[PDB]
Amino acid sequence: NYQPTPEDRFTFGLWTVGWQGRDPFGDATRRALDPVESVRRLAELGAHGVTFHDDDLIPFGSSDSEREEHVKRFRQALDDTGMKVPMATTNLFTHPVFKDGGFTANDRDVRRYALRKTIRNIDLAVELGAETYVAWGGREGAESGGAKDVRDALDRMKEAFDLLGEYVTSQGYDIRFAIEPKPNEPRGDILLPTVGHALAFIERLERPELYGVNPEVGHEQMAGLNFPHGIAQALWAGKLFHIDLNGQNGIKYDQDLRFGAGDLRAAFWLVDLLESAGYSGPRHFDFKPPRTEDFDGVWASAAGCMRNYLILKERAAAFRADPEVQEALRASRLDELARPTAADGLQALLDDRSAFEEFDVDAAAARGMAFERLDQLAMDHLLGAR
Amino acid sequence: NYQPTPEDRFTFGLWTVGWQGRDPFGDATRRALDPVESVRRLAELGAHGVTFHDDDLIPFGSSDSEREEHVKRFRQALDDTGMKVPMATTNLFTHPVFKDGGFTANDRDVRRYALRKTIRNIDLAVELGAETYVAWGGREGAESGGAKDVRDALDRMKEAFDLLGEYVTSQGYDIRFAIEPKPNEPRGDILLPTVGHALAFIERLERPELYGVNPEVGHEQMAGLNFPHGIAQALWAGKLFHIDLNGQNGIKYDQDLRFGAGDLRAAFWLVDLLESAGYSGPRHFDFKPPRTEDFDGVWASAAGCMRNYLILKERAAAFRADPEVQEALRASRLDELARPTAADGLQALLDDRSAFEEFDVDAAAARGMAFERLDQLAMDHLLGAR
Amino acid sequence: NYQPTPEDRFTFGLWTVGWQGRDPFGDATRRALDPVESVRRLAELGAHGVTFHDDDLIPFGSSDSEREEHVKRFRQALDDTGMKVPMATTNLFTHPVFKDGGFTANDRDVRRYALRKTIRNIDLAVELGAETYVAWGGREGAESGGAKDVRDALDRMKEAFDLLGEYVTSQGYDIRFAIEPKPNEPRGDILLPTVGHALAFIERLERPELYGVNPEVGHEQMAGLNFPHGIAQALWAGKLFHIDLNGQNGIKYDQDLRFGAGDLRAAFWLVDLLESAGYSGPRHFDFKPPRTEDFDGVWASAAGCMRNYLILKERAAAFRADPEVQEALRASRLDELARPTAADGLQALLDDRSAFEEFDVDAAAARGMAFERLDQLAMDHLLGAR
Amino acid sequence: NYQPTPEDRFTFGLWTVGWQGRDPFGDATRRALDPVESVRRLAELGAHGVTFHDDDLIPFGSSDSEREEHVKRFRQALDDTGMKVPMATTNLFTHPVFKDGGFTANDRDVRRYALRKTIRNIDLAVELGAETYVAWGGREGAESGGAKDVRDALDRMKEAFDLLGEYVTSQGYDIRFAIEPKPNEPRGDILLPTVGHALAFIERLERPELYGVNPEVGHEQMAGLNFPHGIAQALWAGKLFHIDLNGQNGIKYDQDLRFGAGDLRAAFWLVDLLESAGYSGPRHFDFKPPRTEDFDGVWASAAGCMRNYLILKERAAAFRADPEVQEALRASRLDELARPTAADGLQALLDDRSAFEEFDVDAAAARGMAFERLDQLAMDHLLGAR
Ligand SMILES: OC[C@H]1O[C@@H](O)[C@H](O)[C@@H](O)[C@@H]1O
Ligand SMILES: OC[C@H]1O[C@@H](O)[C@H](O)[C@@H](O)[C@@H]1O
Ligand SMILES: OC[C@H]1O[C@@H](O)[C@H](O)[C@@H](O)[C@@H]1O
Ligand SMILES: OC[C@H]1O[C@@H](O)[C@H](O)[C@@H](O)[C@@H]1O
Ligand SMILES: [Mg+2]
Ligand SMILES: [Mg+2]
Ligand SMILES: [Mg+2]
Ligand SMILES: [Mg+2]
Ligand SMILES: [Mn+2]
Ligand SMILES: [Mn+2]
Ligand SMILES: [Mn+2]
Ligand SMILES: [Mn+2]
């Protein structure tokens, strides 16, 4: 039952199953994973491919020699499995040099360094087949109000992403960028804290068509926002280039639970949206097997990410396919929602007396929305109780 | 001390000092205010002007006759005081007809009604001198996931705001629009939940130059976001057409405390930003005197809004003017933040070996940001302890 | 399927299905319900009984005459249905007189009034069969720090509940009290904000055995707390006298969605706990049919409360009954958790060298908890995917 | 100005100024501190003393030999400075062995190990002068609902703290225990998540008089609770044995900013309470100099903790001492709050017709609380604007 296959486009970061378990209050509980072993174990679980930070694949400060061997091993692992690399990203957060950010560090030389580090990995990403290069500004932010002039920092961020856009256009690369928003942690407040903020920022960039969002379930939920809604806005904008899936129990530290845990109902409405909107990008899991687990639990947890998506996909598909649900949708006027409000135009609307002077407001007010019955149908389907 | 004057551009909604105290669990504790009395009492407190929902000024369902007398009284009150009306807005939330929204109700006739109601008040707003017409989609949203197709709802919202833009362009009006974001309440999740989401949405509108944001201190804080940061992003985008000021104690129901209460430090960093960025629009207070107060407390609470802004303005101005602070700002490299990261261009950056190959990363990493000393200087100033 | 029967002990407040839909930003969308009609419609849905605030049953300021007719009608409705009244409570929040609280108002005469109002309804509750009298201090609190001396207010609250305890002991009543915690709303912060705070407070009361908690799913979740955990602590303390069930989507205004909505997984772990711990009190639904609904949706929403509990009860029972789950429970050492840590006593523990000097820490550290596999089994069961 | 002296009873954990800056997404930015250097630098800043986890002072797995030298060096540093050690605690969270908790690990041998580790450090704490031994159950909890039977875990926690109580009674030690609550992180939900929960739990212990709370500003605020209120409840209960001070910006990861940052107004109301209630225990700072800082910033940040307390203490003292404030307090009936509600007893209250039958409810309802004017006086004082 619910066995993932490569056509489900499930991908995992190297840093996910590879997470060693060091948290703010704790030492590592698992040994470091050879990226080659992760490629194989993930392929045996049915995954479509893998993603990486530069520093996951090539340890920081590697010689050109050692860099080459690390890439070669990895490429060989991709060969014998067919594993794809749809996305890659830069580690602009771990090293002490980035303690005040990468692209928006107050120190200018750190900003130039960040760009060179990113540009080097773009090349590697493009060679491996990456279609999206993700930017997560984990360190772009502040704990205190005087430490960052946010308008100047937005200048520096626009200038960085404008340079990366100019670079990929000069190389004729096909790769596109996706900003991964996060509201906070490890900075007190992170710039571009939500999907909305990243989407707005992209529109001031020089080549906005090159940039989209990589939203993460848990990150929007850390601001208490509705992740299915934010995704619909990203899709509405045409900017859902990529997506990070995982679990989060409300507003607290970034948990990165396996997808399906955390807000289960939101997970259902999310899968329902991706599937019914025809999202065709990677279903990427940016999660962490809890440090309570050993390696067996790491792989069970990763298997759980895909299984929960597949179960949810089946419940949503049956929900939409149900005639009582289709009848409930009309009863709640979801079909009227898709109708243009005034396709007769402004002037016709201004003269329409049934739109104001003769609008029976109390009759329209007394029409129940029948939202609760529709939602119990969704609940019944989610729980298999139909 | 700290006495507000009209040049401080402090404005209040009729619905603020006029709030009667009915909350979800409680009946009203104060009698309804005559809008004329509010105009006068606010002018006697030093306010610049007032704002209104249509339904604050003209009770719902008024005859053309009674509408005229309500407007005439109001206009006379503005005459004898000089009170301005910089902003007006539509009540698309109180009446039962809007229980599923205005511009994005599933019922199409309610959507057309909402537009006619808005368009009627636009005319009145323009006649009274309003420069901004605010849209707050309080009812645009859902409590459950199946009740609203968010992409279709975004279609309906874009079509509504496109029609309002077409209307004001046809009348040659000067007024501009400002979306007032709110993440939730009274809907479980409200569309365009934050400043970011509203800014992004505006860029898909047909005449984006006509639309900006009216951010509210408390609303961004209900998503746990940094209001001074979101404001800097709005200013960076050129979209801070208007601003709502008040207090909020973290993530919970919309409190609308008087400005200064709630997150005091955020209030300081906010005033510091508006003043140093040269914001020149209204300092509008969308707050509610707590229902524990009588009319004396209503007016003391409103006076508190302006007083706290003025005290904070003086502390921030002294903070910036302090030489130790200017020295602390350089010590934290805030001046380096304003410098272009790579004004020598992409190619020069690619060949700069001091940007990567010869970048001493450990030396840059060991340079402390001196952020804590700068913040204690800000704290010392805020508390008058210098 | 999943049809509730009186033996399921489902109860509803009069104020739940009877909620008219007035919220902070909105007028009522439904007409007021005759309490008699609610008793009948709820009995036809399979409910065990009803609960009430005094002011739900007898309108405020009723003559002794009119009070009598309202009680008589109600008692007749209970007769022809067999509906029980397991719990009643006082409205110490709606009337303007309680704007600063009931038992902890700063005004002493309001405090004495609150007690008389409560004591009058205790009598009525006891006559109707109530076993629990619930106290919700909705108005006990403050928006600002100087407005309430919290230690003095705790004195006044202890003195109130001590008087109610002295009253029920003098009348020889069997009824017991249950404090219903809420962290905020409509006050900025409410005293005894969580289950923990109420449990602690009870231990300083004069007859602690008379007092327990009435925890509400949504209220603990408004503080971001784990409701199943808090319930286990209440059960552990022997104080789960009663329970309020409903849905809440994280930290925001009190939503009071129907049980099952909001945090579905928490709902599952809750039902799993009540059932496996043998809770035998009322399954009380303190929810609100969203104001988008008409009367048909009110009753569908109420039916949804019971249906979701019953579905969840079946999933949890099957989860516990599953041999793979019982094997997973042992694999995660849940059975070792029930074992006394040192039943050999302090001295034996002090001399046990396998407890410290010869404890192989790295071997114990390398034993995975197998928590993820256990949780996917729970997920599989919840979703019917076994 | 505002220079701390030992009589201010300011203490710091070794792990605070000693925090190296490793966070979930980042490597350390500062070198490890010699505990001896920290004792001296803190004494030069005016601190009263220091606190430690066992593993801060003696590195894990130290020989009896090396343990002795580490303790000897430390004791010598305390000698030449006069620095006190008022509190010590056990590290039951860092080592991988504690990944599922200490006292409530599912593995029984880990639970016995935890107790032996705690008991060993109790001895050392008592020898150094510690009056409070703090328990922080950082790892007591779960990420998923099936992983922890919370009632069994409460059994194991009561049995652990009962054994520690039996141990200190057998040795005739004077030291008392203080539970340090935290709602979450690093576990998804931590047992005894708030002050309320810990206070309640203490009352089921065998010798409750030996146990109090060590509340942390930021931890209650991570549940969105009012820290000054929770402290008043702890004081009301007689259980404020100790207190952790720091800053937190709302509901998010545990920030541990320096005291004064985060919720400044709450900091003011906190100092106002500790001082006016006559708290005489340590003012302990459990904070972390942000990893952006070098060693100069570490010490400036620590100096900021004490300075902000001292500034706030002066503002609160002047607030209380102000005659307009004392007049405002009476105007808001804070003096009536301290009066017994019904010292005439139950029967007199039952017969008092001015308490119900002849209570003019509308007159009492129309008396404003004058809370806003009182709060602006507090604000004016806090900002030095009087
Ligand atoms: O940089 C991209 C990735 O970095 C990871 O370390 C973080 O956990 C993710 O939030 C992000 O997707
Ligand atoms: O519609 C504009 C205004 O409506 C008011 O009722 C709400 O309180 C505000 O959020 C908003 O500024
Ligand atoms: O007073 C008891 C009840 O009052 C109701 O109005 C509130 O909604 C509930 O929180 C509470 O259970
Ligand atoms: O164990 C006591 C201390 O441990 C520290 O590591 C944590 O940061 C604190 O929350 C706690 O006060
Ligand atoms: Mg991510
Ligand atoms: Mg507003
Ligand atoms: Mg309730
Ligand atoms: Mg602590
Ligand atoms: Mn994450
Ligand atoms: Mn608001
Ligand atoms: Mn509720
Ligand atoms: Mn902390």
SS3 letters across A165-220: HHHHHHCCCCCEEEECCCCCCCCCEECCCCHHHHHHHHCCCCCHHHEEECCEHHHH
Told to judge if B56 belongs to the known catalytic residues of this protein, a careful annotator would answer yes
Alpha-carbon span B72 to A5, nearest angstrom: 71
Q: Which chains touch D (3 or more CB pairs under 8 A)?
A: A, B, C
Q: In chain B, which residues have their Cβ closer than 8 Å to the Cβ of A337?
A: 104, 106, 148-149, 152-153, 156
Alpha-carbon span A283 to A286, nearest angstrom: 10
Task: Quote the DSSP letter at residue D32.
Answer: P
**A264–C264 CB contact, under 8 Å:** yes
Query: Smallest CA–CA separation between C312 and chain A, in Å?
Result: 8
Whether D15 lines ligand 4, by a CB cut-off of 6 Å, is yes
CB nearest C186 (choices: B26, B184, B188)? B26
* Nearest C-alpha in B relative to D386: B1
Alpha-carbon span C288 to A113, nearest angstrom: 56
Q: Which ligand is nearest to the CA of C219?
A: 11
Q: Quick count: other Cβ atoms within 10 Å of Cβ C35?
A: 19
**D194–C196 CB contact, under 8 Å:** yes
CA atoms within 13 A on the CB side of B374: 24
* Nearest C-alpha in B relative to A320: B146
Q: In what order do the strands lie in the sheet with B84-89?
A: B211-213, B176-179, B132-135, B84-89, B49-53, B10-13, B283-285, B244-245
Alpha-carbon span B362 to D292, nearest angstrom: 14
| C280: its two tokens | 């035998």
- Identity of residue A29: T
Whether D100 lines ligand 4, by a CB cut-off of 6 Å, is no
CB A285, CB A305: distance < 8 Å: yes
Report the residue count for chain D: 386
**D293–B368 CB contact, under 8 Å:** yes
Supply the residue whose CA is at minimum distance from atom 8 of ligand 4. Answer: D286
| B19: its two tokens | 């709030």
| C31: its two tokens | 């007409």
Alpha-carbon span B67 to C107, nearest angstrom: 43
CB D119, CB D132: distance < 8 Å: no
Strands C10-13 and C49-53: parallel
Find how far residue C253's CA is from the centre of its chain: 17
**A196–B195 CB contact, under 8 Å:** yes
Q: Is C155 annotated as a binding residue?
A: no
Query: What is the SS3 assignment for chain B?
Result: CCCCCHHHCEEEEHHHHCCCCCECCECCCCCCCCHHHHHHHHHHCCCCEEEEEHHHHCCCCCCHHHHHHHHHHHHHHHHHHCCEEEEEECCCCCCHHHCCCCCCCCCHHHHHHHHHHHHHHHHHHHHHCCCEEEECCCCCEECCCCCCCHHHHHHHHHHHHHHHHHHHHHCCCCCEEEECCCCCCCCCEECCCCHHHHHHHHCCCCCHHHEEECCEHHHHHHCCCCHHHHHHHHHHHCCECCCEECECCCCCCCCCECECECCHHHHHHHHHHHHHCCCCCCEEECCCCCCCCCHHHHHHHHHHHHHHHHHHHHHHHHHHHCHHHHHHHHHCCHHHHCCCCCCCHHHHHHHCHHHCCCCCHHHHHCCCCCHHHHHHHHHHHHCCCC
Task: Measure Cα distances from A359 to A278, A354, D287 in Å.
Answer: 39, 5, 61
Bridge partners for B220 per DSSP: none
Q: How far apart are the first and last CA of chain D?
A: 19
| A4: its two tokens | 């993932």
CB D94, CB D61: distance < 8 Å: no
Ligand 3 pocket mutation pick from C117, C132, C180, C284 by most atoms within 8 angstroms of CB: C180
Apex CA C214: angle with CA B252 and CA D147, to 5°?
80
Q: In chain D, which residues have their Cβ closer than 8 Å to the Cβ of B300?
A: 372-373, 376
Residues sharing a CB contact under 8 Å with residue B337, sequence separation 6 or more, in sequence order? A104, A106, A148, A149, A152, A153, A156
Query: What is the SS3 assignment for chain A?
Result: CCCCCHHHCEEEEHHHHCCCCCECCECCCCCCCCHHHHHHHHHHCCCCEEEEEHHHHCCCCCCHHHHHHHHHHHHHHHHHHCCEEEEEECCCCCCHHHCCCCCCCCCHHHHHHHHHHHHHHHHHHHHHCCCEEEECCCCCEECCCCCCCHHHHHHHHHHHHHHHHHHHHHCCCCCEEEECCCCCCCCCEECCCCHHHHHHHHCCCCCHHHEEECCEHHHHHHCCCCHHHHHHHHHHHCCECCCEECECCCCCCCCCECECECCHHHHHHHHHHHHHCCCCCCEEECCCCCCCCCHHHHHHHHHHHHHHHHHHHHHHHHHHHCHHHHHHHHHCCHHHHCCCCCCCHHHHHHHCHHHCCCCCHHHHHCCCCCHHHHHHHHHHHHCCCC
Residues with CB under 6 A from ligand 2: B 15, 53, 89, 134, 136, 180, 244, 286
Q: In what order do the strands lie in the sheet with A176-179?
A: A211-213, A176-179, A132-135, A84-89, A49-53, A10-13, A283-285, A244-245
Q: Give C 217-256 residues with CB within 8 A of chain A.
A: 221, 224, 250-252
- The CATH number of domain A1-386, selected from 3.20.20.150, 3.50.50.60, 3.40.50.300, 3.20.20.220: 3.20.20.150
Whether D12 lines ligand 4, by a CB cut-off of 6 Å, is no
**D297–B376 CB contact, under 8 Å:** no
Alpha helices in chain C (DSSP H): 14-17, 35-44, 54-57, 64-81, 108-128, 150-170, 195-202, 217-222, 227-237, 264-276, 295-321, 323-331, 334-337, 345-351, 361-365, 371-382
| CB-based contact, C60 to chain B, within 8 Å | no
Task: Quote the DSSP letter at residue D88.
Answer: E
Is the omega angle on the peptide bond into residue A290 within 30 degrees of 0, that is, cis?
A: no
* Nearest C-alpha in D relative to B305: D376
Alpha-carbon span D332 to D336, nearest angstrom: 9
| C132: its two tokens | 């629990």
CA pseudo-torsion sign B155, B156, B162, B166: positive
On the 0-12 / 13-18 / 19+ scale of CB atoms within 10 A, A203 is middle
CA atoms within 13 A on the CB side of A30: 25
Query: Which residue's structure tokens are 């049953």?
Result: C57
Element containing residue D133 per DSSP (H, E): strand D132-135
| A161: its two tokens | 């992403």
Please state whether D370 falls in left (phi above 0), alpha (psi between -120 and 50) or beta: left
Q: Helix axis angle, A295-321 relative to A264-276, nearest 10°?
A: 60
Is the omega angle on the peptide bond into residue D186 within 30 degrees of 0, that is, cis?
A: yes
**A186–D138 CB contact, under 8 Å:** no
Residues sharing a CB contact under 8 Å with residue B335, sequence separation 6 or more, in sequence order? B329
Task: Measure Cα distances from B257 to B288, B382, C140, C195, D319 in Å.
Answer: 6, 20, 18, 27, 21
Helices (H) and strands (E) in chain D, counts: 16, 10
Ligand 2 pocket mutation pick from B14, B89, B118, B222 by most atoms within 8 angstroms of CB: B89
On the 0-12 / 13-18 / 19+ scale of CB atoms within 10 A, A163 is buried
Bridge partners for D247 per DSSP: D257
Q: Which chains touch C (3 or more CB pairs under 8 A)?
A: A, B, D
Q: Is A68 annotated as a binding residue?
A: no
Bridge partners for B10 per DSSP: B283
Strands C189-190 and C141-142: antiparallel
Q: Where are the domains of chain C?
A: 1-386
CB C58, CB C71: distance < 8 Å: yes
Q: What phi and psi values does residue D134 have, to the nearest 5 degrees? A: -95, 135
Q: What phi and psi values does residue D165 have, to the nearest 5 degrees? A: -65, -40
> In terms of Cα–Cα distance, which of B130, B375, B131 is closest to B269?
B375
Report the residue count for chain B: 386
Helix (H, G, I), strand (E, B) or coil at C76: helix
Helix (H, G, I), strand (E, B) or coil at C245: strand
Residues sharing a CB contact under 8 Å with residue D344, sequence separation 6 or more, in sequence order? D352
Alpha-carbon span C29 to A371, nearest angstrom: 14
Query: Which residue's structure tokens are 């129907």?
Result: C258
Element containing residue D85 per DSSP (H, E): strand D84-89
Alpha-carbon span D300 to D317, nearest angstrom: 25
| A75: its two tokens | 């490429």
* C229-265 residues labelled b (16+ CB within 10 A) or e (exposed): bbbbbbbbbebbbbbbbbbbbbbbbbbbbbbbbbbbb
Task: Quote the DSSP letter at residue D341.
Answer: S
| D177: its two tokens | 């225990």
Residues sharing a CB contact under 8 Å with residue B79, sequence separation 6 or more, in sequence order? none
Alpha-carbon span C264 to C248, nearest angstrom: 9
Find how far residue A315's CA is from the centre of its chain: 22
CA pseudo-torsion sign D101, D103, D105, D110: positive
Q: Quick count: other Cβ atoms within 10 Å of Cβ A330?
A: 12
| CB-based contact, D63 to chain B, within 8 Å | no
CB B313, CB B276: distance < 8 Å: no
Residues sharing a CB contact under 8 Å with residue A65, sequence separation 6 or more, in sequence order? none
| CB-based contact, C289 to chain B, within 8 Å | no
> In terms of Cα–Cα distance, which of A223, A25, D154 is closest to B229?
A223
**B222–A224 CB contact, under 8 Å:** yes
| A226: its two tokens | 């509705």
Q: How far apart are the first and last CA of chain A?
A: 19
Element containing residue D285 per DSSP (H, E): strand D283-285
Task: Measure Cα distances from C314 to A260, C309, C318, C321, D137 in Å.
Answer: 20, 9, 6, 10, 34
Q: Quick count: other Cβ atoms within 10 Å of Cβ B79?
A: 10
CB C251, CB C224: distance < 8 Å: yes
Alpha-carbon span C222 to C262, nearest angstrom: 11
| CB-based contact, A261 to chain C, within 8 Å | yes
Bridge partners for A245 per DSSP: A285
- Identity of residue C100: D
Helices (H) and strands (E) in chain C, counts: 16, 10
Q: What is the greatest pairwise CA distance in chain B? A: 80
CB nearest A94 (choices: D27, D99, D252)? D27
| A·C CB contacts under 8 A | 132
Q: What phi and psi values does residue C132 have, to the nearest 5 degrees? A: -125, 135
- Identity of residue A228: P
Task: Measure Cα distances from B309 to B283, B285, B315, B344 in Å.
Answer: 9, 10, 10, 42
Supply the residue whose CA is at minimum distance from atom 10 of ligand 3. Answer: C136
Report the residue count for chain C: 386
On the 0-12 / 13-18 / 19+ scale of CB atoms within 10 A, C32 is exposed
Residues sharing a CB contact under 8 Å with residue C323, sequence separation 6 or more, in sequence order? none
Helix (H, G, I), strand (E, B) or coil at D250: coil
Alpha-carbon span A233 to A195, nearest angstrom: 9
